[PDB]
Design a protein around this ligand. Structure first.
Ligand SMILES: CSCC[C@H](N)C(=O)OP(=O)(O)OC[C@H]1O[C@@H](n2cnc3c(N)ncnc32)[C@H](O)[C@@H]1O
Ligand SMILES: [Mg+2]
Ligand SMILES: [Mg+2]
Ligand SMILES: [Mg+2]
Ligand SMILES: [Mg+2]
Ligand SMILES: [Mg+2]
Length: 505
């Protein structure tokens, strides 16, 4: 019953873009899908408020860092609420309890003998917020940039605590091979295994040139590497260091870390090493998703897609749908103003909206707003119902692999079958007929159409909560008839349906 799922927590240095929304909406779907399938869900999201990337942004505006971090964190939380993210905690690394969780992890790591003091010299990217070797850098017209990210970098000489990541090279490979579903998609798993197979170096995990961060226990001259306290948020969200609490007993180890492909090393290499050191159970699964481009990365150079405005321009549930359908989850895809509209027009307004409005209006005008009593199901009726009866298990299967796009595609294939069934059955002809065989068929074909629309509506709840709820409202479904257990219970004939209205204006 317990299920603990998390998102990456965002740098509140600038405003959110669609990519941030992509990850919160995707993770929200999974969360809502589990709640509807009788799971006890915990859903963590939040912001990563420390580090030099955020401090140098507050210096680029005139405001203290804490204030920039607080204010821009509100903007991230306000954005998530606007997109209807059902998170159970919005964590912020400035929270006092997170300060204590981070300090305990350090203790257990130092007590295991995996932390040692030494001099560090190397090339640090503030944007990426990670260290680079001279080799993974290139000099371009007198500017020092990263070979992969092309990011600026600053030379740094400091005495810092290191982590014996070198001590965990082989345990990690062994864990990777005994836990095949630990990293997904498979392409990314192969990439982590290759990196670790080449050997790991020890990792600087503290800083002395600035104090914006969590205070290293018994060493105020140091603050933790921002990624060390950032990864800890997944423990903080479960009640650590109170490992005897109800929260930590049932929710840790986390079932699923949702992240983007650029931060996999921190989650699949560093994070499990830190937990083996501190004697803590590892997460069960990390799924790294792709990046959303615009026609072109999303650079503050003038190419940002604002998710709140995107939602105001087209609706919350329309954006959530397009993001989880347009892009095979796990691959890289791109946004375009034209692709979102055509997608919405063909998939929501027509393929699903018409089928629901056309069927719900015949019930209003010809059957006195009551679900009709169906007769015997012909071979066309039962085979359509069969398709819709077997969806829950196909869709569940897809959600378990993080393929929401294939879950949606499956729902729409049935809807296509439903429209094509609506056309071969021509129920608008039978309504007029005074014969009794035509009427019963009219009553039967209309029930079948409403019934499969009700199943779709239920299965759509995780992606389009509001619209699905609207459709179920128009189908006379009560508030306790909206779990996945209701999928297998047939629409009750004769229920009073309210007068139909547009779901996708
Ligand atoms: C303990 S976790 C700390 C994480 C760290 N604080 C951090 O990396 O912060 P972040 O704000 O820059 O990125 C936050 C998340 O959004 C993703 N992301 C970023 N741009 C994206 C895009 N264009 N498309 C899809 N996903 C994207 C990105 O891959 C990441 O998973
Ligand atoms: Mg963008
Ligand atoms: Mg397609
Ligand atoms: Mg997707
Ligand atoms: Mg299938
Ligand atoms: Mg009749």
């Amino acid at each position: 019953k317990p299920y603990y799922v998390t998102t990456a927590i965002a740098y509140p240095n600038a405003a959110p873009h669609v990519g941030h929304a992509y990850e919160y909406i995707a993770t929200d779907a999974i969360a809502r899908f589990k709640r509807l399938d009788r799971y006890d869900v915990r859903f963590l999201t939040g912001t990563d408020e420390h580090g030099l990337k955020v401090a140098q942004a507050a210096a680029a505006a005139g405001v203290p860092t804490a204030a920039l971090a607080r204010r821009n964190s509100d903007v991230f939380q306000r954005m998530q609420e606007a997109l209807n993210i059902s998170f159970d905690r919005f964590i912020r690394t400035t929270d006092a309890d997170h300060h204590e969780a981070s300090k305990e992890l350090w203790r257990r790591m130092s007590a295991a003998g995996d932390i040692y003091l030494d001099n560090y010299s190397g090339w640090y990217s503030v944007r990426d917020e990670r260290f680079f070797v001279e080799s993974e850098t290139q000099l371009v017209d007198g500017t020092r940039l990263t070979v992969e990210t092309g990011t600026p970098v600053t030379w740094t000489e400091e005495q810092t605590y290191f982590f014996r990541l070198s001590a965990y090279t082989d345990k990690l490979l062994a864990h990777y091979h005994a836990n095949p579903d630990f990293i997904a998609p498979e392409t990314r798993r192969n990439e982590v295994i290759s990196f670790v197979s080449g050997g790991l170096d020890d990792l600087s995990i503290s800083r002395t040139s600035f104090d914006w961060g969590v205070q290293v226990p018994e060493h105020p001259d140091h603050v933790m590497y921002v990624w060390v306290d950032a990864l800890t948020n997944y423990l903080t969200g479960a009640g650590f260091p109170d490992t005897d609490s109800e929260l930590f007993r049932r929710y840790w180890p986390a079932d699923l870390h949702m992240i983007g492909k650029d931060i996999i090393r921190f989650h699949a290499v560093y994070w499990p090493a830190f937990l083996m050191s501190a004697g803590i159970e590892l997460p069960r699964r990390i799924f790294a998703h792709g990046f959303l481009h615009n026609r072109k990365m999303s650079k503050s150079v003038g190419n940002i897609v604002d998710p709140v405005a995107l939602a105001e321009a087209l609706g919350v549930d329309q954006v959530r749908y397009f993001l989880l359908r347009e892009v095979p989850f796990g691959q890289d895809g791109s946004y375009s103003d034209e692709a979102i509209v055509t997608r919405i027009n063909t998939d929501l307004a027509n393929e699903l909206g018409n089928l629901a409005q056309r069927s719900l209006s015949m019930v209003a005008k010809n059957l006195d707003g009551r679900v009709p009593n169906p007769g015997e199901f012909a071979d066309a009726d039962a085979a359509l119902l069969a398709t819709a009866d077997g969806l829950l298990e196909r869709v569940r299967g897809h959600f378990d692999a993080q393929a929401m796009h294939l879950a949606l595609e499956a729902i729409w294939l049935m809807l296509g079958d439903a429209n094509k069934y609506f056309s071969v059955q021509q129920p608008w002809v039978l309504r007029k007929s005074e014969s009794e065989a035509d009427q019963a068929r009219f009553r039967t074909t209309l029930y079948v159409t409403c019934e499969v629309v009700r199943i779709a509506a239920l299965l759509i709840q995780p992606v389009m909560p509001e619209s699905a709820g609207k459709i179920l409202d128009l189908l006379g479904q009560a508030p306790n008839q909206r779990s996945f257990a209701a999928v297998g219970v047939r629409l009750t004939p004769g229920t009073a349906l309210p007068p139909p209205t547009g779901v996708f204006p």
